[PDB]
Design a binder for this molecule. Structure first.
Ligand code: D9F
Length: 358
């Protein structure tokens, strides 16, 4: 009944296992659904951070989702737009008065959500001597102390600092910390069971780590150099990331649970980048593609097997969530690996979508 060629599930498992057997990556897991029903899910390999014997990789293993945290930040922003507390055309200076200066005074909330605010990829912690970057106002005043790379609406430039600002805006608008809002109005509201900004001590043994750095960050109470965890730092599982993708595919609903109105989701999944604008990723020119309100619309169509309209987001880790609304199809995966490799992160997407039938 899922209308999927299970011959491609065999290829997907052998593809991941072949890289595991060759030592390219330690573990891998995935979960795919059609019509809201999961029909295939597998966890492969073993993990260790360097201080442990290799433990099994399971489907409920907690793993940092990295850049996928931005998707949680995008939902939280739009919830406040639905409540009328925020507006996408609001200048950031109205909420953060430190932005009332040339260059920064032109930035609107819409520019941050779509990576068009002209911000660089990341702020520099080495040049921030004597400044507590974990403090909200000290981080903002040091941010506006650093020049902007481009003007607003000049180019698409992936920026970590953009979503850090949004997390601050959520905090100043709601009156609670960013992590408190997301945990209450998204994590607990969507019924996510294995998702935490900071994993409790009784569950840290079930968190997948693959490097010394990840073990150290797992035992910490803050982000190393950001006032919040809006751009990165969330820990989750396959099913919880799957629930988030399915909520988007159903336009804000997940059975009895509702996070966004359907008209809001249709706007988030809508291309928001003006045509002909250049795209940059980490100091390199990237191919022009659709981008919504924090949600990626590329890759889709073209030489890929994902139908046009497939929305997505990847995360450093690596991980990823892909959902094809035209096929009622969702695919999420964890591939913990030191450096990015398209053969492990992107290539399996060809194997998966090749299995869809009728
Ligand atoms: C499909 C692409 C992925 C290709 C980019 C990765 C290249 C690998 C190594 C490079 O040195 C850069 C890398 O280390 C730095 C990664 C920073 C954060 C990445 C995540 O936020 C995923 C973002 C995906 C967005 C667009 C895209 O287009 O993702």
């Amino acid at each position: 009944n899922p209308a999927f060629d299970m011959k491609q599930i065999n290829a997907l498992n052998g593809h991941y296992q072949t890289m595991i057997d060759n030592g390219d990556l330690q573990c891998a897991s995935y979960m795919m659904s059609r019509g809201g029903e999961v029909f295939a899910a597998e966890s492969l390999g073993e993990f260790t951070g360097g201080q442990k014997e290799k433990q099994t990789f399971q489907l409920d293993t907690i793993r940092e989702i990295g850049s996928l945290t931005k998707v949680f930040t995008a939902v939280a922003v739009m919830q406040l737009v639905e409540k009328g507390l925020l507006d996408l055309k609001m200048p950031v200076k109205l909420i953060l008065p430190a932005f009332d200066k040339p260059g920064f005074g032109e930035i609107k909330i819409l520019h941050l959500l779509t990576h068009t605010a002209g911000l660089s990829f990341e702020l520099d912690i080495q040049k921030a001597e004597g400044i507590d970057l974990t403090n909200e106002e000290e981080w903002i005043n040091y941010l506006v102390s650093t020049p902007l790379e481009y003007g607003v609406d000049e180019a698409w430039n992936y920026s970590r600092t953009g979503f850090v600002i949004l997390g601050i805006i959520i905090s100043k608008v709601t009156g609670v910390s960013y992590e408190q809002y997301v945990t209450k109005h998204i994590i607990e509201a969507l019924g996510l069971e294995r998702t935490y900004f900071y994993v409790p001590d009784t569950l840290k043994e079930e968190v997948c780590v693959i490097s010394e750095h990840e073990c150290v960050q797992l035992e910490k109470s803050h982000h190393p150099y950001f006032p919040n965890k809006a751009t990165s730092g969330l820990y989750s599982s396959l099913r919880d990331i799957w629930k988030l993708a399915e909520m988007f595919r159903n336009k804000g609903r997940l059975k009895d649970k509702k996070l966004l109105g359907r008209k809001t989701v249709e706007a988030m999944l809508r291309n928001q980048i003006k045509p002909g604008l250049p795209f940059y990723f980490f100091g390199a020119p990237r191919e022009e593609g659709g981008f919504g309100l924090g949600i990626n619309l590329w890759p889709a169509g073209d030489h890929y097997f994902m139908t046009e309209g497939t929305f997505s987001h990847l995360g450093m880790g690596w991980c990823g969530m892909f959902s094809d609304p035209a096929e009622d199809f969702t695919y999420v995966f964890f591939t913990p690996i030191s450096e990015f490799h398209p053969h492990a992160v992107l290539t399996p997407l060809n194997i998966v979508w090749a299995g869809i039938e009728l």
